[PDB]
């Protein structure tokens, strides 16, 4: 599962992100070209320091976050300048708000486009670039993300920031809850499962275990709960034996059909009753059929 902490596309230009070149630098623009909003073009300024900060996205429980970018770019030689846009981030603890302190922002890899550059804007061409990066481990209660411009004509369309979690699942008659994924490749989050209703752990067997990885995936289930006597596995829950069926022991077997010379059993039966006269040997299990009484 993915949990989004910021989606610029969903806000639709409602997010008043702060820009360090106050006006005429990083600025928000509307361009219904299809309405699609985008932040966008000052190349003639040689040594420029154009920055764009996002809102104080609350870290919550996340450990490693992912940034998905959709954007368009210019050629830098079509109009007679660079293109290597830079991504940054801040690991803070309080929402300062109007505090574009560029001194502490730890540049992420220099994002670059692929596919097509400026081409033709709207007249003789109508496709973007979806590039994703990630940072971590994050340990402060808050975190910010930024974008730096040294002179490129870019217009950025979709900024999505999300983190990964292992979803809930019902495996082996046991319930494993939703657990936050980790940050770094070696880390595995071992999680113990809770037996579903009417499931019990076998006497000589391990308790149900599942391992949650940094990619938000469950791996190597260990152990398993079992449907007890009178119940059978259905989907991933325990269901009472249908009438006319029994389950002698708490096992992996499905409900067994009633044996010879026995009356139909009620719902969720442990054993099928002998007939009007037929008896079963005291030592014999309830899996055995009945016999008459000479």
């Amino acid at each position: 599962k993915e949990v989004v902490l910021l989606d610029f596309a969903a806000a639709g230009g409602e997010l008043g992100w702060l820009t360090h070149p106050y006006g005429k630098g990083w600025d928000l623009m509307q361009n219904i070209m299809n309405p699609i909003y985008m932040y966008s073009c000052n190349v003639m300024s040689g040594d420029q320091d154009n920055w764009l900060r996002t809102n104080w996205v609350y870290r919550g429980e996340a450990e490693r976050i992912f940034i998905e970018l959709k954007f368009t770019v210019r050629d830098c030689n079509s109009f007679p300048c660079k293109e290597t846009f830079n991504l940054y981030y801040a690991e803070s603890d309080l929402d300062y708000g109007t505090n574009f302190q560029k001194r502490l922002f730890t540049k992420i890899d220099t994002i670059a486009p692929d596919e097509i550059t400026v081409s033709s804007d709207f007249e003789a061409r109508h496709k973007l670039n979806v590039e994703e990066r990630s940072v971590g481990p994050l340990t402060r209660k808050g975190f910010y993300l930024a974008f730096q411009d040294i002179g490129a004509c870019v217009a950025l369309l979709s900024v999505r920031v999300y983190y990964k979690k292992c979803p809930e699942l019902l495996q082996g008659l046991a319930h494993f809850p939703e657990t936050i994924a980790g940050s770094d490749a070696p880390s595995l989050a071992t999680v113990a499962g809770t037996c579903v209703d009417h499931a019990v752990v076998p006497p000589g067997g391990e308790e149900p275990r599942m391992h949650c990885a940094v990619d938000g995936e469950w791996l190597v289930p260990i152990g398993q709960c079992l449907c007890q006597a009178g119940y059978e596995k259905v989907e991933d829950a325990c269901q009472a034996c249908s009438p006319g069926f029994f389950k002698f022991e708490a096992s992996e077997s499905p409900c067994l059909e009633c044996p010879e010379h026995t009356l139909p059993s009620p719902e969720g039966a442990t054993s099928c009753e002998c007939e009007e006269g037929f008896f079963r040997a005291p030592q014999d299990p309830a899996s055995m059929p009945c016999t008459l009484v000479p």
Partner: antibody
Framework: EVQLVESGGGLVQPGGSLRLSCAAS????????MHWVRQAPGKGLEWVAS????????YYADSVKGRFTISADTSKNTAYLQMNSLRAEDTAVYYC????????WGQGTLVTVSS | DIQMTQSPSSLSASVGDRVTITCRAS??????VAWYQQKPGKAPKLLIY???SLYSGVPSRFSGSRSGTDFTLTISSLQPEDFATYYC????????????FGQGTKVEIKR
């Protein structure tokens, strides 16, 4: 899901022999009793044979006792009915089904017995 | 060999009517009774088991009842997909005694 497939039917001269096959998938046939039921053309249902591999008992009907043989191969997940010394009265469509309260049925295979 | 005597052999009714088929066994058969539906061409289809329990996935308008040796299949409001032939079956003893069926009951559309 659960599915049962039948094969083996056709003509046989009176007094001949023929073997029928019931290919199962979606459940273990050891854990379930398998039965053969025939439906004469235009007539009702008539029970032919039963088998439960868990207890190893084989139950026949009177009109077919001695002439028909039920059997089951646990490995191939398949049930069989071997028919010998066939007569015209045996002409019918043969079905196989799981459990005494038959819940999943095969599609049915036609056995014609005549000269 | 137990006998199942299904009555009636045939009955004609209209859509929406309540329909009742009876099957009387020649001996106490406990609850070892099942009811089946067979449209022409297709194979039978299980409807009721234990003579009063609805097979999972069968529309609930079908119900089975027992009054002693008298087993009834009942349909609250006959739908067009319900015109077919219906068989009762007894499986008392799960093989101690032979399996026998009702003689069947074809339900046809009134017109």
């Amino acid at each position: 899901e659960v599915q049962l497939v039948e094969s083996g039917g056709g003509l046989v001269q009176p007094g001949g022999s023929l073997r029928l096959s019931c290919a199962a998938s979606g459940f273990t046939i050891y854990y379930s009793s398998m039965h053969w039921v025939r439906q004469a053309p235009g007539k009702g249902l008539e029970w032919v044979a039963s088998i439960s591999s868990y207890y190893g008992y084989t139950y026949y009907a009177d009109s077919v006792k001695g002439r028909f043989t039920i059997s089951a191969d646990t490995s191939k997940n398949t049930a069989y009915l071997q028919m010998n010394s066939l007569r015209a009265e045996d002409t019918a469509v043969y079905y196989c089904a799981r459990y005494y309260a038959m819940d999943y049925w095969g599609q049915g295979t036609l056995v014609t017995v005549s000269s | 060999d137990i006998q199942m005597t299904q009555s009636p052999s045939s009955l004609s009714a209209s859509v929406g009517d309540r329909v009742t088929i009876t099957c009387r066994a020649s001996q106490s058969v406990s609850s070892a009774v099942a009811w089946y539906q067979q449209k022409p061409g297709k194979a039978p289809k299980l409807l009721i088991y234990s003579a009063s329990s609805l097979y999972s996935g069968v529309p609930s308008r079908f119900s089975g009842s027992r009054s002693g040796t008298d087993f009834t299949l009942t349909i609250s409001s006959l739908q067009p997909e319900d015109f077919a032939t219906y068989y009762c079956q007894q499986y008392y003893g799960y093989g101690g005694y032979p399996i026998t069926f009702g003689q069947g009951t074809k339900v046809e559309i009134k017109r």
